Amino acid sequence: INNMSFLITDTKSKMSRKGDRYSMQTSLIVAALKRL
Amino acid sequence: FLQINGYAVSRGFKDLELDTPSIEKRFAYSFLQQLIRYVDEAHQYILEFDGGSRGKGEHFPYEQEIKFFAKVVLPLIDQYFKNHRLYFLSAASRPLCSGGHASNKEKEMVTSLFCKLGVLVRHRISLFGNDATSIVNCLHILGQTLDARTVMKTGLESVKSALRAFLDNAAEDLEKTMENLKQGQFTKGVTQIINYTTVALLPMLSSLFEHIGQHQFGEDLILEDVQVSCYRILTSLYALGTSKSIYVERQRSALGECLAAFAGAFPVAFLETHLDKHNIYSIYNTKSSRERAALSLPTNVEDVCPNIPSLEKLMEEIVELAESGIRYTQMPHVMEVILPMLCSYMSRWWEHGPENNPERAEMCCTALNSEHMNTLLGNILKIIYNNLGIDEGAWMKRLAVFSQPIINKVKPQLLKTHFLPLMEKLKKKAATVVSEEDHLKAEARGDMSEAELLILDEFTTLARDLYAFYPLLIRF
Amino acid sequence: GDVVGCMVDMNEHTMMFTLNGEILLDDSGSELAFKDFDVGDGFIPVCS
């Protein structure tokens, strides 16, 4: 799970090492709380 | 002193010749020429080794050559095309406004290199050992980098024939795999083919079809004999997905994703055969009766895919799904291959649906509608609702990935009776979990001391259900 | 025809930009266009 496949996919629909490349901001729960 | 006396001193060695030709004097041209030549010598040495190892000369003098090939040429190709994908994929339409605009000959040689690597990988997943991953990765990247439209509209007939023959070989391998899986499932060529398909063919075809569908290359490349080969591929993939076999049990996921990519890429509405007469791209409209009889075709538009059901019938099957309360362990292939296929098919064919173009209606290829999508998504949601607390697996997470494009054309009235019960069962599960937490606060860890495997498993299942649903929730 | 809404928070020393009501983001997921800056003599709306 990288949350990127949901982070960078939603823009088209709305028409508007591992340690360093991995972040937690793509979490579904926190994304939902921001969007709701 | 020259300047103050005004003596003009110039560069003195101005360019005497234009030195213009870009089609020949480019680094990409030279590099791909060398790469294709090296792949050619690799192919000839691999056939020589095939003839020698089975003979007296098992020892191969070409150890240094094969080592250089595997350890240099393949990763170099992979990294180079990953870095410069946009340059080769650019056309008259500009993806990268800075520059680039790869030449037609360069695109031709990209396609030729992909075809040569496909020929090399065909039925040879063992001679390279661990290099099977390298060759399949290079083929994946190359297939993502192909420019099918430009290659077909301008290119050498040899390269076009190689591109057609790659798909023909893929269809033949799929047919061989199904035919030796049927009446052969009880019981080394069959094993070699069954391993080769899983290792290489399904990922390569998946990536190529996904790229073709994304870039709308199906209407330019999948024509006539290419359409016949794609019919064969579709039949083989669907029947492999539907078949009940211990061999296909653990490969049906790759079959499902490949079938979804093929449904997205294919330019003919195979599910809705009755409206195939309006599709100009149809071989059943272009090839005419005499060549369609000369070719291996059922001569009828409906009978092209006898096993694949019609869209309405498959909608009816999906509707009685999640209403009969059928579970993943029982009837798994349907929601493993059919549902991603339906999602991809609808995502492709909504633009061609009459709702996009209400004018000149009933001349459009399909009969798809936003009502079809909302019904499909509701049936999916009922499936996941019924399989929420029991029979959990990565299918919930993968189906959620597949169902994302459908959400764009869903009315908000679904949430009035679908989107609340799912969070209802989530709060019930989470409240139960925090209830046993409020009971046994003291022990909450991963090992096995006092009944904490139950709480760990319930936490994992609720987390996986939350990633089943929350992508749908946020994009709704 | 796009409308850019510019927000400044001089209490927390932050700046934000929205395009048609949607908050713009940097390379990361941060909503802050400029995370930190001294108050100085203040700020005024400006365009070029």
From Swiss-Prot, chain A:
It comes from the Eukaryota. Induction: By TGFB1. Channel activity is modulated by phosphorylation. Phosphorylation is increased in failing heart, leading to calcium leaks and increased cytoplasmic Ca(2+) levels. Detected in heart muscle (at protein level). Heart muscle, brain (cerebellum and hippocampus) and placenta. It is linked to Ventricular tachycardia, catecholaminergic polymorphic, 1, with or without atrial dysfunction and/or dilated cardiomyopathy: An arrhythmogenic disorder characterized by stress-induced, bidirectional ventricular tachycardia that may degenerate into cardiac arrest and cause sudden death. Patients present with recurrent syncope, seizures, or sudden death after physical activity or emotional stress. CPVT1 inheritance is autosomal dominant. Ventricular arrhythmias due to cardiac ryanodine receptor calcium release deficiency syndrome: An autosomal dominant arrhythmogenic disorder characterized by syncope, cardiac arrest and/or sudden unexpected death, often in association with physical exertion or acute emotional stress. Patients who survive manifest polymorphic ventricular tachycardia and ventricular fibrillation. Unlike typical catecholaminergic ventricular tachycardia, arrhythmias are not reproducible on exercise stress testing or adrenaline challenge. Belongs to the ryanodine receptor (TC 1.A.3.1) family. RYR2 subfamily. The calcium release channel activity resides in the C-terminal region while the remaining part of the protein resides in the cytoplasm. This is Ryanodine receptor 2. The gene is RYR2.
From Swiss-Prot, chain C:
It is linked to Ventricular tachycardia, catecholaminergic polymorphic, 1, with or without atrial dysfunction and/or dilated cardiomyopathy: An arrhythmogenic disorder characterized by stress-induced, bidirectional ventricular tachycardia that may degenerate into cardiac arrest and cause sudden death. Patients present with recurrent syncope, seizures, or sudden death after physical activity or emotional stress. CPVT1 inheritance is autosomal dominant. Detected in heart muscle (at protein level). Heart muscle, brain (cerebellum and hippocampus) and placenta. The gene is RYR2. The calcium release channel activity resides in the C-terminal region while the remaining part of the protein resides in the cytoplasm. The lineage of its organism: Eukaryota, Metazoa, Chordata, Craniata, Vertebrata. The chain holds residues 1159 to 1206 of 4967 of the full protein. This is Ryanodine receptor 2. Induction: By TGFB1. Belongs to the ryanodine receptor (TC 1.A.3.1) family. RYR2 subfamily. Homotetramer. Can also form heterotetramers with RYR1 and RYR3. Interacts with FKBP1A and FKBP1B; these interactions may stabilize the channel in its closed state and prevent Ca(2+) leaks. Interacts with CALM and S100A1; these interactions regulate channel activity. Identified in a complex composed of RYR2, FKBP1B, PKA catalytic subunit, PRKAR2A, AKAP6, and the protein phosphatases PP2A and PP1. Interacts directly with FKBP1B, PKA, PP1 and PP2A. Interacts with SELENON. In cardiac muscles, identified in a complex, composed of FSD2, CMYA5 and RYR2. Channel activity is modulated by phosphorylation. Phosphorylation is increased in failing heart, leading to calcium leaks and increased cytoplasmic Ca(2+) levels. Cytosolic calcium-activated calcium channel that mediates the release of Ca(2+) from the sarcoplasmic reticulum into the cytosol and thereby plays a key role in triggering cardiac muscle contraction. Aberrant channel activation can lead to cardiac arrhythmia. In cardiac myocytes, calcium release is triggered by increased Ca(2+) cytosolic levels due to activation of the L-type calcium channel CACNA1C. The calcium channel activity is modulated by formation of heterotetramers with RYR3. Required for cellular calcium ion homeostasis. Required for embryonic heart development. It is found in: Sarcoplasmic reticulum membrane.
